[PDB]
């Protein structure tokens, strides 16, 4: 019992995807402490209209003003589960809504979306059903762990430059000014919690959001949010083509799911400076590959994701927070399933299970 991932199997009409609604939010602070409020939310603040063009030094402060998170801490769903626990009696959708939902991180859904096109990076998703609700929690594969531990210095600095770009583009207050003189602390995060539905699969998920744009067309979340990215400056049509085919797919999937309608890219030169900014509206990203023989197709992404959710729901029959069905996938193969109990794979903590049980 496995699930094939070839795009041709999923090339039908675009499935139903509910306009996402923000149910709430939470923040993680510089010490990675949870707070049930928007204190981590920053505000889109691009270069002044009359000033010079961007020249953001993304290397500035690396590494002496860099406070990296501890990647050996496995948080799994814990922060989202705290939000759910604290809001379980205030969820919309009527009685039993949560029991019919699938609960996960936005990025887990992103990896499902891009699976039909992914050629390098496999994944593992642990699944447990508990009080009807299906929970999906990513497991770091042994190969991803090894590449994390052997991360080249170049790639470590590139992760910093991404975070640093937000420091140049966002302010602590609406209409305020950025202040890049501080530290880059990757514990800090603002997370939007969303309701959606894909096909007949209700979803509750959360995703980190870079900033709110007081100038957005719509002021209500998630339509007012902006996702920030960096990418190498491109100079040839072939370079742009490769960017549309590979990078844009991931940018699209990540922001389509939570309803974030704009991705703003800082293009960086080889010396590490952002010299150019470009806005990519999420619902226009596919236009760049719509007539491309080697392009991606959002219908394939969403139809595979729906097929996986159906596959996971029908595979995880037993309601048991200590039981895990592990869905494993590597490029060139189907999604396969193995069954595990308790540690290490079981991921729903007793502080969640016990409260929900009572
Ligand atoms: C809080 C969190 C869980 C929210 O999840 P999410 O929104 O679903 O995560 P996404 O994968 O979509 O990533 C969104 C952002 O989180 C941040 N982030 C994600 N993984 C990160 C890491 N390993 N280190 C630092 N920051 C990270 C980045 O700012 C990223 O933005 P980008 O896509 O522009 O790079 C996520 O930010 C996070 O911390 N993920 C780390 C998970 C992890 O390390 N798992 C272990 C391997 S399985």
UniProtKB/Swiss-Prot annotation:
Residues 227-230 are annotated as: Adenosine 3',5'-bisphosphate. Disulfide bonds: none annotated. Transmembrane segments: none annotated. GO terms for biological process: mRNA catabolic process; NAD-cap decapping; nuclear mRNA surveillance; nucleic acid metabolic process; RNA destabilization. Its EC number is 3.6.1.-, 3.1.13.-. Pfam families: RAI1. Its cofactor is Mg(2+). The keyword Repressor does not apply. This is Decapping and exoribonuclease protein. Substrate binds at residues 32, 75, 105-107, 191, 208, 229, 254. Adenosine 3',5'-bisphosphate binds at residues 159, 210, 254. The 5'-3' exoribonuclease activity is inhibited by adenosine 3',5'-bisphosphate. It is an enzyme of class 3 (hydrolase). InterPro entries: RAI1 (IPR013961), RAI1-like_fam (IPR039039). One of its GO terms (cellular component) is nucleus. It is found in: Nucleus. Binds 2 magnesium ions. Keywords: Exonuclease, Hydrolase, Magnesium, Metal-binding, Nuclease, Nucleotide-binding, Nucleus, Phosphoprotein, RNA-binding. Belongs to the DXO/Dom3Z family. Mg(2+) 1 binds at residues 166, 210, 227-228. It catalyses: a 5'-end triphospho-ribonucleoside in mRNA + H2O = a 5'-end phospho-ribonucleoside in mRNA + diphosphate + H(+); a 5'-end NAD(+)-phospho-ribonucleoside in mRNA + H2O = a 5'-end phospho-ribonucleoside in mRNA + NAD(+) + H(+); a 5'-end NAD(+)-phospho-ribonucleoside in snoRNA + H2O = a 5'-end phospho-ribonucleoside in snoRNA + NAD(+) + H(+); a 5'-end (N(7)-methyl 5'-triphosphoguanosine)-ribonucleoside-ribonucleotide in mRNA + H2O = a (N(7)-methyl 5'-triphosphoguanosine)-nucleoside + a 5'-end phospho-ribonucleoside in mRNA + H(+). GO terms for molecular function: 5'-3' exonuclease activity; magnesium ion binding; mRNA 5'-diphosphatase activity; mRNA binding; nucleotide binding; RNA NAD+-cap (NAD+-forming) hydrolase activity. Mg(2+) 2 binds at residues 166, 208, 210.
């Amino acid at each position: 019992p496995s699930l094939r991932t070839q795009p041709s199997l999923y090339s039908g009409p675009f499935p139903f995807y509910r306009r996402p609604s923000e149910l709430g939010c939470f923040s993680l602070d510089a010490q990675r402490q949870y707070h049930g409020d928007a204190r981590a939310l920053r505000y889109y603040s691009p270069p002044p209209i009359n000033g010079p063009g961007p020249d953001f030094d993304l290397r500035d402060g690396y590494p002496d003003r860099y406070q990296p998170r501890d990647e050996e801490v496995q948080e799994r769903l814990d922060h989202l589960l705290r939000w759910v626990l604290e809001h379980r009696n205030q969820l919309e959708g009527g009685p039993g809504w949560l029991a019919g939902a699938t609960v996960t991180w936005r990025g887990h859904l992103t990896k499902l979306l891009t699976t039909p096109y992914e050629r390098q990076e496999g994944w593992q998703l642990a699944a447990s059903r508990f009080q009807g609700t299906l929970y999906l929690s990513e497991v770091e594969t042994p190969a991803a762990r090894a590449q994390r531990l052997a991360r080249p210095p170049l790639l470590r600095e590139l992760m910093y430059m991404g975070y640093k770009f937000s420091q140049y583009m966002c302010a602590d207050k609406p209409g305020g000014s950025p202040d890049p003189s501080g530290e880059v602390n990757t514990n800090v995060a603002y997370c939007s919690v969303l309701r959606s539905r894909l096909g007949n699969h209700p979803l509750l998920f959360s995703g980190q959001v870079d900033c709110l744009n007081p100038q957005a067309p719509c002021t209500q979340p998630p339509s007012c949010y902006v996702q920030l990215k960096t990418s190498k400056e491109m100079h040839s049509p072939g370079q742009w083509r490769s960017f549309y085919r590979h990078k844009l797919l991931k940018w699209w999937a990540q922001s389509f799911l939570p309803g974030v309608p704009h991705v703003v890219a800082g293009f960086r030169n080889p010396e590490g400076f952002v010299c150019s900014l470009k806005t990519f509206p999420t619902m226009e990203m596919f236009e760049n590959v719509r007539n491309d023989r080697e392009g991606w197709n959002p219908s394939v992404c969403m139809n595979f994701c729906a097929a996986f959710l159906s596959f996971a729901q029908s595979t995880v029959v037993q309601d048991d927070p200590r039981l895990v069905h592990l869905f494993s996938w590597e490029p060139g193969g189907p999604v396969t399933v193995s069954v595990h109990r308790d540690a290490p794979y079981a991921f729903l903590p007793s502080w969640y299970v016990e409260t929900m049980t009572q």
